[PDB]
Design an enzyme around this catalytic site. Structure first.
Site, PDB file in Angstrom:
ATOM      1  N   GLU A   1      29.568  11.140   2.574  1.00  0.00           N
ATOM      2  CA  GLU A   1      29.940   9.767   2.888  1.00  0.00           C
ATOM      3  C   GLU A   1      29.713   9.270   4.312  1.00  0.00           C
ATOM      4  O   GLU A   1      29.416   8.121   4.511  1.00  0.00           O
ATOM      5  CB  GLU A   1      31.347   9.446   2.428  1.00  0.00           C
ATOM      6  CG  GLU A   1      31.609   7.948   2.356  1.00  0.00           C
ATOM      7  CD  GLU A   1      32.746   7.624   1.415  1.00  0.00           C
ATOM      8  OE1 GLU A   1      32.734   8.122   0.250  1.00  0.00           O
ATOM      9  OE2 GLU A   1      33.652   6.877   1.844  1.00  0.00           O
TER      10      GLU A   1
ATOM     11  N   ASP B   1      33.741  -2.480   5.897  1.00  0.00           N
ATOM     12  CA  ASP B   1      33.393  -2.119   4.535  1.00  0.00           C
ATOM     13  C   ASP B   1      32.213  -2.926   4.138  1.00  0.00           C
ATOM     14  O   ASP B   1      31.967  -3.993   4.698  1.00  0.00           O
ATOM     15  CB  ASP B   1      34.451  -2.729   3.622  1.00  0.00           C
ATOM     16  CG  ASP B   1      35.420  -1.752   3.107  1.00  0.00           C
ATOM     17  OD1 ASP B   1      35.480  -0.625   3.639  1.00  0.00           O
ATOM     18  OD2 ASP B   1      36.149  -2.138   2.169  1.00  0.00           O
TER      19      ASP B   1
END
Length: 318
Positions: free
Chosen positions: A162, A171
């Site tokens: 990730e 985000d």
């Protein structure tokens, strides 16, 4: 007769209430059913009776986890006890009460506890109130180490797949975020983000954190994921069937795509649950997933296929 029981120290977060402590004091553990502790000399004592008693606990059934091969990895807290057992009657001092694996590992290594541990039967009492009895403390220490390894490895795995950021960032959806998973706030304000982060870390961050803090946050995130996986009728049977490394790959996928995304690979999950690894691998490679993040999918799949850390091994502790 339990041997040393008033020797050594006991690590417990729970603190009940020059005094009466010599007397027996009985208490129910705040969060759980059928944990009844007896305190003499300030020491936690777990007692089990086949018969009925007002101050004693009903007999506990033994968990299915292998003492040689198995893991406590995705449990939040565990309990550790030493003591003795003879038919109908069990008496165990509590060495660690609802502590983390790391905590228990260090606590059982204190030389002062050394005496009480080599002279008694050692067992672990899980948050589901089943126990794993151990042959000896060395074995139990092995079991715990093997568990904490999985815990430190899953962080590295996700760092690599990730990404890990040490400053607040946004985000793909706009939301202030930090570390690997972690969402601070859905509010448009950077001060709201910073303030949330300070609250979670408990110091003045100015929006930047250590790797260790990010690791703390990430562990909260692994627990929220495991809590959601077991709630989902599609994920639970698969997760239940997998060994610890493979569960790490399953959690990885959940972190990336959501519970709902992972639940959509229906055939690949059935294949995983039937332990057909190469088929599952081939099938998983069919998805747009495999095409969009190919490095990460390849490692996750290799992990599903081998049950080992081989795709990540050389990359660890980086």
């Amino acid at each position: 007769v339990p041997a040393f029981l008033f020797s050594g120290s006991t690590l417990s977060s729970y603190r009940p209430n020059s005094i009466t402590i010599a007397l027996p004091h009985y208490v129910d553990l705040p969060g759980r059913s059928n944990f009844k502790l007896m305190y003499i000399m300030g020491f936690p004592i777990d007692t089990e009776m086949e018969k009925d008693s007002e101050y004693s606990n009903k007999i506990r059934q033994e968990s299915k986890i292998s003492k040689t091969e198995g893991t406590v990895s995705y449990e939040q807290k565990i309990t550790v006890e030493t003591g003795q057992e003879k038919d109908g009657v069990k008496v165990y001092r509590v060495m660690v009460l609802e502590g983390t694996i790391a905590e228990s590992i260090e606590h059982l290594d204190k030389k002062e506890n050394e005496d009480i541990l080599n002279n008694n039967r050692n067992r672990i009492v899980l948050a589901d109130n089943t126990v794993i009895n151990f042959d000896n403390i060395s074995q139990l220490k092995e079991f715990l180490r093997r568990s904490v390894n999985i815990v430190v490895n899953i962080f590295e795995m996700l760092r690599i797949d990730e990404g890990l950021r040490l400053k607040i960032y946004k985000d793909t959806e706009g939301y202030y975020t930090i570390g690997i998973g972690h969402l601070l706030t859905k509010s448009p304000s950077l001060n709201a983000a910073k303030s949330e982060l300070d609250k979670a870390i408990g110091r003045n961050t100015n929006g930047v954190i250590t790797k260790d803090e990010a690791e703390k946050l990430f562990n909260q995130d692994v627990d929220a994921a495991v809590r959601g996986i077991l709630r989902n009728a599609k994920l639970k049977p698969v997760y239940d069937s997998l060994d610890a490394v493979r569960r790490a790959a399953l959690i990885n996928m959940v972190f990336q795509m959501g519970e709902t995304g992972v639940a959509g690979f229906t055939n690949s999950l059935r294949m995983l649950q039937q332990k057909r690894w190469d088929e599952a691998a081939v099938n998983l490679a069919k998805s747009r997933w495999y095409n969009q993040t190919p490095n990460r999918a390849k490692r996750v799949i290799t992990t599903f296929r081998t049950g080992t850390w081989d795709a990540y091994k050389n990359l660890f502790e980086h």
